[PDB]
Amino acid sequence: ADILPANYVVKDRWKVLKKIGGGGFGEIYEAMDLLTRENVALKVESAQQPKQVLKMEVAVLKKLQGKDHVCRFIGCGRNEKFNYVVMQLQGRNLADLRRSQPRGTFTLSTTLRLGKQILESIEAIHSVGFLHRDIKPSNFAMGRLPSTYRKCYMLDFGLARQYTNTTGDVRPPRNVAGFRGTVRYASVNAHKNREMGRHDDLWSLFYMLVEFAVGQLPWRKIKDKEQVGMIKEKYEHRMLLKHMPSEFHLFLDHIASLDYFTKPDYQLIMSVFENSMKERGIAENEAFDWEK
Ligand SMILES: COC(=O)c1cc(Nc2ncnc3[nH]ccc23)ccc1Br
C-alpha cells in the first residue's frame, strides 16, 4: 500500500492528486499546491525506513537553487509517519521517452543535445561540492511548461555525497565504499567498491549516451551486480564507439585517465558534443524526437 492515499493534504497545503512513481528509497506523487494553485511534485519516505535519503535531497536542492537544470524548491518537513520534499513538477523522463522510441534509440541530434544539457547538470552539482552517484535516464526529465519543454532537469539527489569539506578542499576517500546507484550505468570503479568521484558521474553519462544512440548496452540483460562488473572489466570499451561520433574516443580516453583526485576537463567533453553537432549540421534549435 501507498504511504499517502489520494486527496491526502500534507501540512494544510499539498493535496495528493496521484502517485507518479518511486520504487527504491520512497514514493513520488503529483500534488496540487493549495497556496499557489501550481501542480507540484511531492517526494515522501516512510519514517520507519532504514535508509533516509530525503535529508540529502533537501541539502543539495537548496545549494543548487539559481542553477539551470534543477527543480525549484517549494518546501519540506517531517512527522512520525513520513518525511517529505516538495519541488517543481516536470514532464516525461528520458528512460520513458527512450522506451517510447520506435527502435528504443534516439537520433544523434537528440542524443548530443541531451548530452550537452546533462553534462551542464553534472558540472553544476560538482560545482557545489557534491557527487550525484546515480546518473541514469530516469533521473532526467524535460519541462512541462511552454517556457520549459525544451529544457532537461536533474530530478533526484538521494544518493548524493559531499566530496568537499568545510574548508573547500577535497576530503580523503574511504578505503572502501558500498555500491551506490544503478547497476547498468555504474562505472567499473563503483563495481570494485572504490570511493566514487566526479569521473564516475561522467562514466554514467558516457554509458547513457551509448544506450541513447545504440539502444542497448552489452550488460542490458544481466541483473547480478558482480556479473555486470565482470562484463564491464572484460569489455573492450572502444567497441562501444562503433556507432558513435568519432570525437567520442576523446571522451572515453579522458574519463578512463581520471581518478578520485583529479578534476575532470568538462570543456573537453563539451567540445566533443559541440564538434559532433557542427560536423553533422545539427542545430541547437532542432526539435527533439518526441516532438516529431
Ligand atoms: C526514478 O525516477 C522515476 O522513475 C520517476 C521519477 C519522477 N520524478 C519527477 N517527475 C516529475 N517532476 C519531478 N520533479 C522532481 C522529481 C520529479 C517521476 C516519475 C518517475 Br516514473
**Radius of gyration (C-alpha) of the chain in whole angstroms:** 19
Q: 42 and 48 in contact (C-beta within 8 Å)?
A: no
| 191 CB neighbour count, 10 Å cutoff | 18
Q: Does 229 lie in the same domain as 216? A: yes
CATH number of the domain residue 184 falls in: 1.10.510.10
* Residue the block writes with cell 501542480: 39
| Residue among 7, 11, 41 at smallest CA distance from 26 | 41
Q: Does 127 lie in the same domain as 63? A: no
Q: Does 208 lie in the same domain as 85? A: no
Q: For the chain, report the end-to-end CA distance as a whole number of angstroms.
A: 38
Listed in sequence order, the DSSP H helices in 128-197 are: 188-191
Q: Which of 2, 96, 134, 169 is catalytic?
A: 134
* Burial of 265 (C-beta count, 10 Å sphere; 0-12/13-18/19+): middle
Whether 4 maps to a domain, the answer reads no
Number of domains in the chain: 2
Phi, psi (deg, nearest 5) at residue 33: -80, 110
Residue 261 domain boundaries: 91-292
Tell me whether residue 28 is annotated as binding: yes
Whose Cα sits closest to atom 1 in ligand 1?
138
Query: What resolution (Å)?
Result: 2.5
Looking at the DSSP bridge assignments, the partners of residue 32 are 15, 39
Q: Does 98 lie in the same domain as 84? A: no
Whose Cα sits closest to atom 15 in ligand 1?
155
Is 134 catalytic? The answer is yes
Q: Does 141 lie in the same domain as 58? A: no
What cell numbers appear for 148 in the block?
A: 520549459
Tell me whether residue 57 is annotated as binding: no
Q: Does 97 lie in the same domain as 85? A: no
Q: Is 90 in the pocket of ligand 1 (CB under 6 A)?
A: yes
DSSP annotation of 281: T
**Best mutation site among 27, 38, 93 for ligand 1 pocket (most ligand atoms within 8 Å of CB):** 93
Q: For 152-291, where are the E strands, in sequence order?
A: 152-154, 161-162
Tell me whether residue 3 is annotated as binding: no
Q: Does 110 lie in the same domain as 236? A: yes
Q: Does 271 lie in the same domain as 175? A: yes
What cell numbers appear for 43 in the block?
A: 517526494
Beta-carbon contacts of residue 222 (< 8 Å; ≥ 6 apart) = 228, 231
Q: Does 78 lie in the same domain as 137? A: no
Q: Does 80 lie in the same domain as 101? A: no
Give Cα 204 to chain centroid, integer Å. 9
